[PDB]
Short mmCIF file of C-alpha atoms and ligand atoms in Angstrom, two decimals:
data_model
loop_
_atom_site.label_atom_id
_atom_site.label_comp_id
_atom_site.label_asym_id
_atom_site.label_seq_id
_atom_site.Cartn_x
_atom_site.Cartn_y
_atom_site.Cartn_z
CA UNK A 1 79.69 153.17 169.56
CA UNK A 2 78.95 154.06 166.10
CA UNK A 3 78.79 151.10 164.42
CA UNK A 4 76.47 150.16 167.75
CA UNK A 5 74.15 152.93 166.88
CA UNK A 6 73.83 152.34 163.45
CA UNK A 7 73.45 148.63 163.36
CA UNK A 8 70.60 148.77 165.78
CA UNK A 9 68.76 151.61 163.53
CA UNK A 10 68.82 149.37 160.58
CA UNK A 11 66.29 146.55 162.99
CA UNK A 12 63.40 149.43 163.15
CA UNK A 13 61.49 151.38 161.00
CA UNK A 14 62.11 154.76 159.53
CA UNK A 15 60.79 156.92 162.53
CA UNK A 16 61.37 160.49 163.46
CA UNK A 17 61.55 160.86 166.86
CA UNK A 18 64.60 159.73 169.01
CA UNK A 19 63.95 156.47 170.75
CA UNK A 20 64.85 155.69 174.19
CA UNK A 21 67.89 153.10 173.43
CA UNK A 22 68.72 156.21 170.45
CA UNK A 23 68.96 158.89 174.04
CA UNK A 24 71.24 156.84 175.80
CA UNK A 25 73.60 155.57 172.83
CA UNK A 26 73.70 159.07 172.64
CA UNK A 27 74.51 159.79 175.75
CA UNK A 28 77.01 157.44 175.85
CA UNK A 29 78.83 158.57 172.42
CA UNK A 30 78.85 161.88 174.34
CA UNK A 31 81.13 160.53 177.08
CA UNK A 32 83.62 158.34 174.98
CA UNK A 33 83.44 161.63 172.64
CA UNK A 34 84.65 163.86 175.56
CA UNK A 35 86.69 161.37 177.04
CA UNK A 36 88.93 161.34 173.72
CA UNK A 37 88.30 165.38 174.18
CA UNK A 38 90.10 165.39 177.36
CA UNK A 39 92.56 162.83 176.67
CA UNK A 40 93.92 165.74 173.50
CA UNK A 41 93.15 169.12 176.06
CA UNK A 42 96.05 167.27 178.37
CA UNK A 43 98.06 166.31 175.09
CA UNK A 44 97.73 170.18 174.21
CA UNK A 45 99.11 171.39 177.59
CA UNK A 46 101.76 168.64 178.74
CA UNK A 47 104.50 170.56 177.05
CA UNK A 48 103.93 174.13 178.51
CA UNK A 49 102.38 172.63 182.09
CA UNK A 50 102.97 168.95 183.21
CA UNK A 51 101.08 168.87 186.26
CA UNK A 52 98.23 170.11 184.80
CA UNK B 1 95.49 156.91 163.46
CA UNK B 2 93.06 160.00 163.50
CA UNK B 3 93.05 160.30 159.64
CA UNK B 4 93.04 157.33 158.55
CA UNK B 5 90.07 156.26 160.63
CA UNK B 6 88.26 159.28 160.07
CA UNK B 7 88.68 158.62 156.15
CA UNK B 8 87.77 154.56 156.82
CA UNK B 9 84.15 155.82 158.87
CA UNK B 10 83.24 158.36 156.27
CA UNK B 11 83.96 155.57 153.60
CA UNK B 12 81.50 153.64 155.78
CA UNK B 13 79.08 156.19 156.08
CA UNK B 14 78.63 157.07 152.40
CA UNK B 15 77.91 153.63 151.80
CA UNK B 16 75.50 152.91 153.93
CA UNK B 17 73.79 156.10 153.76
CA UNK B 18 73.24 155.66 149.90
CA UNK B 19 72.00 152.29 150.64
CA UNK B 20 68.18 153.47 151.76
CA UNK B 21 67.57 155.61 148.98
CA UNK B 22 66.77 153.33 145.08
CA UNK B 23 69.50 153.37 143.01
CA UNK B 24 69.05 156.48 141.21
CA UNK B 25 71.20 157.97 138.78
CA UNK B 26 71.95 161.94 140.10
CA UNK B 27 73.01 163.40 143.64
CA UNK B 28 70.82 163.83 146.00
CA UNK B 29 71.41 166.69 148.84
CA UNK B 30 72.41 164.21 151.41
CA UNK B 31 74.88 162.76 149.72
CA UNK B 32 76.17 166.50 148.76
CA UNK B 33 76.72 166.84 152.09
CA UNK B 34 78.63 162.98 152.82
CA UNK B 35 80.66 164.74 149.78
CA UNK B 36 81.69 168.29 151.26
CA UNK B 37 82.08 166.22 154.77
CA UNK B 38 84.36 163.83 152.89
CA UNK B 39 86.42 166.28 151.40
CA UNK B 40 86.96 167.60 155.13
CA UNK B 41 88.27 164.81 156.72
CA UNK B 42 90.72 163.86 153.38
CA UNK B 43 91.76 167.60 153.73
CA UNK B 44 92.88 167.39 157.08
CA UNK B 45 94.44 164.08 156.22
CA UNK B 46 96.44 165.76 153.66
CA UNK B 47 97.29 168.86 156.25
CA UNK B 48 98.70 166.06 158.30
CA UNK B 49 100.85 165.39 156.25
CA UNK B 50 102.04 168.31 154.72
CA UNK B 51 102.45 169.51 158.39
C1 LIG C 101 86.89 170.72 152.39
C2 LIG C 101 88.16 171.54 152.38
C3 LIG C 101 88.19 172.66 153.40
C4 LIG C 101 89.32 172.56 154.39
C5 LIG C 101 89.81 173.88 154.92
C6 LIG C 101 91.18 174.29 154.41
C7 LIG C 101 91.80 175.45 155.15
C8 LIG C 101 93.28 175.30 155.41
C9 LIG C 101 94.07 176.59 155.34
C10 LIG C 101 94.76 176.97 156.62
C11 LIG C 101 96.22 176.56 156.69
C12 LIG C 101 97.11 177.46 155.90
C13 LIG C 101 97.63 176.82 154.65
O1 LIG C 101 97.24 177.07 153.53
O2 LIG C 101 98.60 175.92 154.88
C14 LIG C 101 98.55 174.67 154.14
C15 LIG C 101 97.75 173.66 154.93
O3 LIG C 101 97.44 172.55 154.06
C16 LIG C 101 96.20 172.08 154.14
O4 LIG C 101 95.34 172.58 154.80
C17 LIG C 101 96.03 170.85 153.29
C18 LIG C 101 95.11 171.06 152.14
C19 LIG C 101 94.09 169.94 152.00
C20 LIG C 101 94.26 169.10 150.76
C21 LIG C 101 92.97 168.83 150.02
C22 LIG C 101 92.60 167.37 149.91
C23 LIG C 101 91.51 167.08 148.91
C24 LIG C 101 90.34 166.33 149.47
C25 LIG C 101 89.55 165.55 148.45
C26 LIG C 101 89.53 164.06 148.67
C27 LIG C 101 88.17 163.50 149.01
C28 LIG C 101 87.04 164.16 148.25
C29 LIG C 101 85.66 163.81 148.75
C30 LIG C 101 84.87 162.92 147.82
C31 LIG C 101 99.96 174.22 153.83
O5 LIG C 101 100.20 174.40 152.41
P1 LIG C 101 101.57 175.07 151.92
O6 LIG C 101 102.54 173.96 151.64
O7 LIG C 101 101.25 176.08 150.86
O8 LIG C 101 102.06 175.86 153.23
C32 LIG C 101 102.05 177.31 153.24
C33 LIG C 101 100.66 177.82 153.50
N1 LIG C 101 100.61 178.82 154.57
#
């Protein structure tokens, strides 16, 4: 996702504002980013709690 | 896994940060900061392994 983010950048210009394609690679960095979250909250608490 | 690709994407990062600016000869403030964030991530490489 990074590298997806970054590459793309590098085809406009220099602009401030957040494009549309920028919101949604956003958007979907935020759900791999969590998903890696969650993966390590149930790494945390298999030991004390496996059902959890 | 975690440290070593955290240390390979900020080894990424400062390089192709640095590549907008002209090829000056001091620090700018960005790349103080790519510094300090560097030093993080090698840190907690290093805590790693101490631990
Ligand atoms: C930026 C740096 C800020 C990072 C925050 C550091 C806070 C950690 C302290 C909390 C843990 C307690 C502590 O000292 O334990 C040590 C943890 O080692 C560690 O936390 C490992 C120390 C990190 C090593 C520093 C690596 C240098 C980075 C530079 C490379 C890249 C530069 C960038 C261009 C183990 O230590 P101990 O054996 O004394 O155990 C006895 C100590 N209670």
């Amino acid at each position: 996702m990074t590298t997806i983010n970054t590459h793309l950048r590098e085809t406009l210009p220099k602009i401030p504002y957040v494009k549309a394609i920028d919101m949604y690679l956003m958007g979907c960095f935020v759900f791999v980013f969590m998903a890696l979250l969650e993966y390590a909250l149930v790494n945390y608490i298999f030991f004390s709690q496996p059902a959890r | 896994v975690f440290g070593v690709t955290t240390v390979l994407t900020m080894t990424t990062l400062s390089i192709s940060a640095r590549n907008s600016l002209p090829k000056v000869a001091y620090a700018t403030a960005m790349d103080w900061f790519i510094a300090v964030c560097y030093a993080f991530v090698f840190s907690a490489l290093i805590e790693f392994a101490t631990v």
